[PDB]
């Protein structure tokens, strides 16, 4: 039996393979709520990674808001890990506070755990403007893009350190001889 074969994200490598990938059996003997929380965490980590890689893509294309955080402007904030210390700590604290506000407004019942009637990752408050759930195909698309972003943000981090601070796109072009 494959109890979690009705959940989005299941990758089937071969026609004779298992419906979803779990070589280490992280989902074995797990109830509905445990897998629900695991999938919720996957979706949140992946959405965070998608936003991070989108930041990398936008800033690495040369685009920057004309923001001036105290004495530091956006043109003085490096693309990559060097922005951790270059950007003022107050801006980081306010971004974390905004994320906390969103968490409060979207996890008020659940606190990261299962909410009956809601699929994992369905965190947007219900509204006719936002078609929230979607079908399994769009959910799998979101999950796969999220997993790609989680792989890619760590590839950016480990790889900016390895290159010694080389621009990720410059490094990519150099490695491909572009």
């Amino acid at each position: 039996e494959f109890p979690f074969d009705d959940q989005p994200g299941g990758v089937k490598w071969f026609p004779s393979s298992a419906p979803y990938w779990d070589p280490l059996g992280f989902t074995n003997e797990k109830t509905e709520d445990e897998y629900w929380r695991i999938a919720h965490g996957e979706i949140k980590n992946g959405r965070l990674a998608m936003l991070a890689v989108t930041h990398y893509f936008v800033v690495g294309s040369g685009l920057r808001f004309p923001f001036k955080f105290g004495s530091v402007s956006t043109a003085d904030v490096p693309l990559g890990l060097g922005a951790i210390k270059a950007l003022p700590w107050a801006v980081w604290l306010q971004i974390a506070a905004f994320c906390l506000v969103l968490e409060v407004l979207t996890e008020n019942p659940g606190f990261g755990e299962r909410v009956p009637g809601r699929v994992p990752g369905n965190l947007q408050p219900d509204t006719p403007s936002f078609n929230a759930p979607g079908d399994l195909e769009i959910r799998t698309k979101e999950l796969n893009n999220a997993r790609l972003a989680m792989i890619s943000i760590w590839g950016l981090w480990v790889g900016e350190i390895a290159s010694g601070g080389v621009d990720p796109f410059t490094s990519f072009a150099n490695w491909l001889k572009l």
């Binding site: 004495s71 107050a90 019942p109 606190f111």
Partner: protein
């Protein structure tokens, strides 16, 4: 012990208790000790709100009343605890007398809700909605914390202006 539906009751997390009292000051549910504690908290918060307004109407704007306060230059009166001795003792006595007269004329009655000390009049709403009671209690808690941290921090820094200290601390 129905303190979950009282004003200013903070539930930190969904699994958290309805209100916050880690030391068990109202754990028995006296309903009279809690009323006294809420009157005390409200009074402290309102006094601190007035004090915070005093602090933040003066700095960094530099605003103060023109002239002298009984042979004492008002521009020579600092912002913070250094103004305790700069202000003439007679002025402090008059301010204390005004506050004491206010307390005598508007005391807390047991029939009225805690903090509803303003004399009854159609112009002044009492006791207000629970939303506004919570807003009053929360802004009072913020002003309480703010003035405690102003006093502890003006002594620690040797007398640095709070706005200057904050600007240096956050980098603006």
């Amino acid at each position: 012990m129905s303190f979950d539906d009282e004003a200013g009751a903070i539930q930190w997390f969904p699994p958290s208790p309805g209100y916050w009292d880690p030391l068990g000051f109202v754990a028995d549910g006296d309903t009279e000790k809690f009323s006294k504690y809420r009157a005390i908290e409200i009074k402290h918060g309102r006094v601190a709100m007035l004090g915070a307004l005093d602090y933040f109407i003066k700095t960094p704007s530099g605003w103060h009343l023109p002239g002298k306060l009984g042979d004492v230059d008002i521009d020579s009166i600092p912002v913070g605890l250094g103004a305790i001795k700069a202000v003439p003792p007679l002025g402090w006595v008059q301010i204390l007398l005004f506050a004491s007269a206010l307390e005598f004329l508007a005391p807390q009655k047991e029939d009225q809700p805690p903090g509803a000390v303003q004399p009854a009049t159609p112009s002044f709403e009492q006791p207000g909605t629970l939303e506004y009671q919570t807003k009053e209690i929360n802004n009072g808690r913020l002003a309480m914390i703010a003035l405690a941290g102003l006093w502890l921090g003006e002594l620690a820094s040797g007398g640095t202006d709070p706005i200057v200290a904050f600007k240096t601390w956050v980098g603006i």
